[PDB]
Design a protein around this ligand. Structure first.
Ligand SMILES: O=C1c2c(O)cccc2C(=O)c2c([N+](=O)[O-])ccc(O)c21
Length: 325
C-alpha cells in the first residue's frame, strides 16, 4: 500500500530534509527563557507558559522527559521543516539544562481552552470553521511528506477569543516513505485507525484522516470519545459495532490481513449502525446532512478510501467558511 497523494515528496527532496538521525542540534541559551507557570503535561513532557528575557515576549516551554536521542532529533527536524506552515505550532529555539542536559523546545506562545469545556460552547459554524483550520495544517504537513500520527483534541490548541488554531505535539510524527513499514503503536487509543488496530504497517497520511474523523464525530454528536475502547482489542470491537463487520472483512481480505484468533472472536458479527442513529436532543443542533456526509467519507476502514486533507477542505460542508475567506 502507498499514499494516493504526496507519495514522492521525500523521494524528490535531498536526504538532509528527511534524514533526521543525521541532525546536529544547535543548542541555544537556556537563560533566555524563564518558566512562569505550568499549563500542561503528557507522558513525554511537561509544558509551561514562559517568558523570553531578552524581549519579555511570552512563549511556550516544552521540557522533554528522558527519551532516546533519535526521537528528539525526529521531533526537532519535523518542526524545523514545518515552521511557517498554516496553523502549525512554531518552534522558536532549542535549549538544554547544562548539568543534566534536559532538553526544552521553545515555541511561540499559544493560548488555549481545554476541549472538555470549550467544545460544548461551539456553534454549528464554529465547528466547521475550526475543523477547516485544522485541515489546512494537515494538508500542509502531508504536502511536506509528514504524518502527524497523533491527531486528537488535546493536540489541537484553540484560542476561541481570537479564533486561532494550532496543531501541536509533533513528538509522534514521522516522514512518509513509500513501502516503509512503520510502528503501529502511535496515536492515542480512541483515535487509532483500523490499520493500527489490525497491524497494517505500511500506512500513510490517511491515518490522520481517520483520527480527524473520530474527533469530528465526537464534536457533532457530543459523544467524547466517539469510539470508547478500553484497550486496543476492544477499540476495534467498538468500531466494528458501528461500521459493521462486513466492511471489516472486505478490508482485511483486500490487504491480506490475518486477524488474531482471540481478537477475531471479540469482534463478532455486527450490522452497520447508521450515523443518524447517533442524533439526539443534545446534538440535534449540530447534526446536518452535510456533516453526516463529510464524516461518512472520513471514517472508512480502508485508508485508501478516506478523503485526503485537500479533498476534505472542498466538501460543501465548509462552503460558507471558504466563502468567508
Ligand atoms: O506537546 C505539547 C505542546 C507542543 O509540542 C507545542 C506547543 C504547545 C504544547 C502544549 O501546550 C502541550 C500541552 N498543554 O496543553 O499544556 C500538554 C501536553 C503536550 O504534550 C503539549
Amino acid at each position: 500500500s502507498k499514499a494516493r497523494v504526496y507519495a514522492d515528496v521525500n523521494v524528490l527532496r535531498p536526504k538532509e530534509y528527511w534524514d533526521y538521525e543525521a541532525l546536529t542540534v544547535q543548542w541555544g541559551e537556556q537563560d533566555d527563557y524563564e518558566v512562569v507557570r505550568k499549563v500542561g503535561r503528557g507522558k513525554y513532557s511537561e509544558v509551561f507558559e514562559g517568558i523570553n528575557v531578552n524581549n519579555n515576549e511570552k512563549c511556550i516551554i516544552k521540557i522533554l522527559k528522558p527519551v532516546k536521542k533519535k526521537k528528539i532529533k525526529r521531533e526537532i527536524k519535523i518542526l524545523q521543516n514545518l515552521c511557517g506552515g498554516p496553523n502549525i505550532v512554531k518552534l522558536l529555539d532549542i535549549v538544554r539544562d547544562q548539568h543534566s542536559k534536559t532538553p526544552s523546545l521553545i515555541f511561540e506562545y499559544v493560548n488555549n481552552t481545554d476541549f472538555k469545556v470549550l467544545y460544548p460552547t461551539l456553534t454549528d459554524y464554529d465547528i466547521r470553521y475550526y475543523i477547516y483550520e485544522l485541515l489546512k495544517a494537515l494538508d500542509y504537513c502531508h504536502s511536506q511528506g509528514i504524518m502527524h500520527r497523533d491527531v486528537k483534541p488535546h493536540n489541537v490548541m484553540i484560542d476561541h477569543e481570537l479564533r486561532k488554531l494550532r496543531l501541536i505535539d509533533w513528538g509522534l510524527a514521522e516522514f512518509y516513505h513509500p513501502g516503509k513499514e512503520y510502528n503501529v503503536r502511535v496515536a492515542s487509543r480512541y483515535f487509532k485507525g483500523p490499520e493500527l488496530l489490525v497491524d497494517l504497517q505500511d500506512y500513510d497520511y490517511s491515518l490522520d484522516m481517520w483520527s480527524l474523523g473520530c474527533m469530528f464525530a465526537g464534536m457533532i454528536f457530543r459523544k467524547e470519545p466517539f469510539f470508547y475502547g478500553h484497550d486496543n482489542h476492544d477499540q476495534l470491537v467498538k468500531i466494528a459495532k458501528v461500521l459493521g463487520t462486513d466492511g471489516l472483512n472486505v478490508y482485511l481480505n483486500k490487504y491480506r490481513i490475518e486477524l488474531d484468533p482471540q481478537l477475531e472472536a471479540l469482534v463478532g458479527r455486527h450490522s452497520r449502525k447508521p450515523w443518524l442513529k447517533f442524533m439526539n436532543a443534545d446534538n440535534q443542533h449540530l447534526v446536518s446532512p452535510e456533516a453526516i456526509d463529510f464524516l461518512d467519507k472520513l471514517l472508512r476502514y480502508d485508508h485508501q478510501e478516506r478523503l485526503t486533507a485537500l479533498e476534505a477542505m472542498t466538501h460543501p460542508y465548509f462552503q460558507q467558511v471558504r466563502a468567508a475567506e
